[PDB]
Symmetry: D2
Subunit: 317 residues, 4 copies
């Protein structure tokens, strides 16, 4: 039978015997995501061009607003927002959400694939909600995923039950389940990183990419792909296998990607899909953050590829 | 004044004082591109998944372009990536134009939701002979129109003609391509290079040297960023929008590159050249290559004039 | 805050402390309505006309499948099916649904407004599901309403909490709650029936309609409207007050419209809006169905108007 | 083979060897109409209900006005929404005068009644400076007219010298697809359409005519009655199924209710091209010579046999 995100989430919820907040949260995110998709695909653009005589900002407003009205959240961290937003007590629910409302957007003018990234934490404590409630390691995630506004719009949702992929059908505004309990290839054949930073790379990354173009075991060299938009690169990685890297560079000594709402959700998705995600020194999900916008290196993808990077990392110490 | 594709085209058609054929042609193509975009974004996918109790997107895309063009009464010969031979339009539906197209470029990887696209180049039939495959064998120098539709975060049709390059955004609420970027030009020099670095061991020594100049500047300048969607239309469009260079060169294993001359390299070269950019195979202008096979491959380095220049300088250092 | 159908039903469910099966049912039918809306508006028609080289039935198929796959129904009665449809054991739920998938499609060739009507019963016996589970008075309805495919598409949902109207936003595929706990006017100024067949009218119908045209006192004669499509006629009556008649006469002593999936849902909606709905002889909701496709007369709308009708009806009885 | 309004229009223009001014206008109307549809079906209504934290007739008028101005094909625009004729600025002047109802039936849209956009297009006839007088042409002078019905689906019906063609809007691709070619109305229908709530006000001709529908003197089947109360809807049904549509004069509306310029003339034009009729009772709607842009006319229109029957009755009563 056809399954939808709405149906899927209510069924899982009923099995966990949960009260419904997470469902209401995920339903509201789904609303926000459909509306961001609408805007990204430029529906209504003629009206801007005068037929009857910002997108990152709107994206933030959509998610911020649908999350508040959900009655499920209490602390909301966005890449757009300097500090955590503390939800008003009347609208307060139990979950903390870290999101990137429109990832890839700084290059939206070339119509590059963009996406929304979210990671959901339950707030355990009896304290009044504070920004510090967002400072959890990714291991604590209850749900995470992303919507990709590529050629088509897909929501990938990860929870304990694994990874599940939902295609937006724009004809009916329905997220349709199209890839159940997804698992990433053990080993892939594409590597993904901005090689313009070659000059800046640590020797571990240098040697690893060197292996990719010039295989030690006489296998075929890996192909290379770097959209430059993380959701697009992480999705392809999930879909076709392989490895994605944003290692530290000169201008980014702790990486450029932000831990809470870029790294953690993609590391969670990956792990739930039987892939891996490391900073090199430890797993992304094990990093305990001290700043809500802290940056992290990230090497993620197919388990064999990632263990081969760390193999090399571990050689250089 | 809001401007759309149909309006722009019609006014150009009138400026030129044409009979209307190229306009019907582009009109048909515009409709095919709308239906492609619809299909690509997965409208109706719910039905494939059993909501009420099938052709692959590249096949559909080809069928939409083929049919619309035949029915525009503006074409006589059609070359499509999908068809080994050129399609000779039936006499009753015959017009003066030859269209070569790639109906859904980058679709081989569509499973990951990569940007994909439709590329076209339009020629006048120049023989008096009955129409044949040979009419499609013109250098891109002879192009009347060309461009692409990109189905990315949004859908955009980029159309290059004598008057220059113009970008139309698809508003899916109404199904109009609205004019959003007029008489586009490329930066003289960019800061991004774009090619599959994974096949580096197969690199031509000129290509190795240039990519080394980009990553490891010899003059204190800042290294270029790398970007490679692996989907031509996405990378070329980024090239057009942000500047820089796109490479699919010939190596040793592929003396003629990989990308197809007629319906891939030519239209993009034409778009680039119309926007004050450059496109070379290494040996000459893409648009100068006189083709001998409709499905023949070509190397292509394209983008900013300064960046391409530099590639050519390095290429000539290796001869 | 912005309210949607899914959110509204989930919060009603949680307030009722239900197990969520009605919510599942409703969300499933919602999905079917969005998809019927898409087909009614002719999305995809270009393909049928060969760009690249049934409606009532498609609507029926959409409703049935979404309902069966909800895990919420056991018996389904459609205008389109000769017999009740018994849901397969593995997907059986507690509810029985009566519906008219595409009401008034008889004339869809003129692009007249169309509609889907539904009424939802809880199954009352533990007996093996049969046609008998559907033979309940409309009084026993848990929920009922309609989807109007008009200038816009709206879902009107009646339950014990009252009547709430939701606007389908096609940009995102969300029913937006635009009218809350709606109530009908006390007295209307519109009468709605098929006057072409005046010669077959009951003496009482004749007199009543004469009174609307030629009022005894110094009042304005009512307007007339008759769409010929029940959902459209009943919605207008809802919004503008007044009276809609599809009455019994000598040749049709039980009327023409069907009790289970036309009259009962509409009478339930009317009653929850403070309206009225009689067969002339009794309230439509009080009629005990003996056959699933049985006919009933219906006079419904603003309470004064309906009571005025009964006065004339009683005059002639 | 698939034909679309844009394709159909161009081919008709090249066939008549026109310069393309009527095509630019008709393309501009087509766009505005898809824009009207999208608003009418309530795309984006969630933003007005505060998802991220104009009146439809007003916006509908603005989309026609701006699209027609920007066509460069028009000089005088008459709209239901505007008391005075709009005179197109000189730099954008073309040769056509367009009278339109940007959102007919809108005043009841609150109940999601079928609404529509109605239009008639005249060539500016006088050589005078563009003014309101340019809109005061008899319906017979129409060059093209029709409507866009926003019902269960959106349809544009376009009537010209080559006849009447109907195009379904496909919302997936924003394209008007030709679905009914060279449309003709049935010789005689079995439906009559009018607001009988004015029965007390009817002149005896209208009273008798309707009586004959209900209690047929040859004892044939009574006509059915339909009345949406939205002109486009009621007239589209009359074209599709045949029969008759009446909105006669009444005490509230002594010169009729429906507007001559942008309700009666466009629909009368469509009817005649489809081989039906349209009369005010005394004369053909298209023969009425207007004196005022918002002037009203009684109207009886539809299948020829049925209008011919109304007129024999009208003549029986003088
Ligand atoms: C007692 N409940 C009952 O009888 N019926 C009923 C109906 C219903 O919808 C109608 C929803 C729910 N509960 C619900 O949603 N709980 S939840 O905490 O939000 C949740 C969602 C997911 C998806 C989880 C999976 C957790 O994986 C990490 S946990 N219950
Ligand atoms: C005699 N024609 C006349 O009086 N009016 C009129 C109306 C009309 O639309 C109503 C269209 C046209 N002509 C037309 O379309 N010509 S065309 O060859 O197809 C063309 C398209 C483009 C875009 C060109 C520019 C090429 O730039 C290098 S040339 N003419
Ligand atoms: C115990 N439940 C719990 O802990 N969480 C939770 C979450 C939830 O959504 C997440 C939904 C629900 N329950 C629910 O839907 N029940 S229901 O029978 O389907 C229903 C729908 C309507 C609309 C009714 C009103 C009927 O009027 C009498 S009753 N429960
Ligand atoms: C000389 N023209 C030529 O060689 N090519 C060419 C191309 C073209 O578009 C590509 C349009 C046109 N002409 C055109 O549009 N004329 S028009 O006055 O606007 C018109 C529209 C309709 C529909 C009419 C029929 C009127 O019947 C009542 S007349 N011509």
């Amino acid at each position: 039978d056809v399954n939808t995100l709405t149906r899927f989430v209510m069924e899982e919820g009923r099995k966990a015997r949960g009260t419904g907040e997470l469902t209401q949260l995920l339903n509201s995110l789904c609303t926000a995501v459909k509306a961001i998709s609408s805007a990204v695909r430029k529906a209504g653009i003629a009206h801007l061009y005068g037929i009857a005589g910002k997108l990152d900002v709107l994206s933030n407003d959509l998610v911020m607003n649908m999350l508040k009205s959900s009655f499920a959240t209490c602390v909301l961290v966005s890449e757009e927002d300097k500090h955590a937003i503390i939800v008003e007590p009347e609208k307060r629910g139990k979950y903390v959400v870290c999101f990137d409302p429109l990832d890839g957007s700084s290059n939206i003018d070339c119509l590059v694939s963009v996406g929304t990234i979210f990671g959901i934490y339950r707030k355990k404590s009896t304290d009044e909600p504070s920004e510090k409630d967002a400072l959890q390691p990714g291991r604590n995630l209850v749900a995470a995923g992303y919507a990709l506004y590529g050629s088509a719009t897909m929501l990938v949702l990860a929870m304990d039950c694994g990874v599940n992929c939902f295609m937006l059908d724009p004809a009916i505004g329905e997220f349709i389940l199209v890839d159940k309990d997804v698992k990433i290839k053990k080993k892939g054949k594409i590597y993904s990183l901005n090689e313009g930073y070659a000059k800046d790379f640590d020797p571990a990354v240098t040697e690893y990419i060197q292996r990719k173009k010039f295989p030690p075991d006489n296998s075929a060299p890996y192909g290379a792909r770097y959209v430059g938009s993380m959701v697009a690169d992480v999705h392809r990685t999930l879909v076709y296998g392989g490895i994605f890297l944003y290692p530290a560079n000169k201008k980014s000594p702790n990486g450029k990607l932000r831990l809470l709402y870029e790294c953690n959700p993609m590391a969670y998705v990956m792990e739930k899909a039987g892939g891996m995600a490391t900073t090199g020194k430890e797993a992304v999900l094990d990093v305990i953050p001290t700043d809500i916008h802290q940056r992290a290196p990230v090497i993620l993808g197919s388990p064999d590829d990632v263990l081969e990077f760390l193999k090399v990392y571990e050689k250089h110490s």
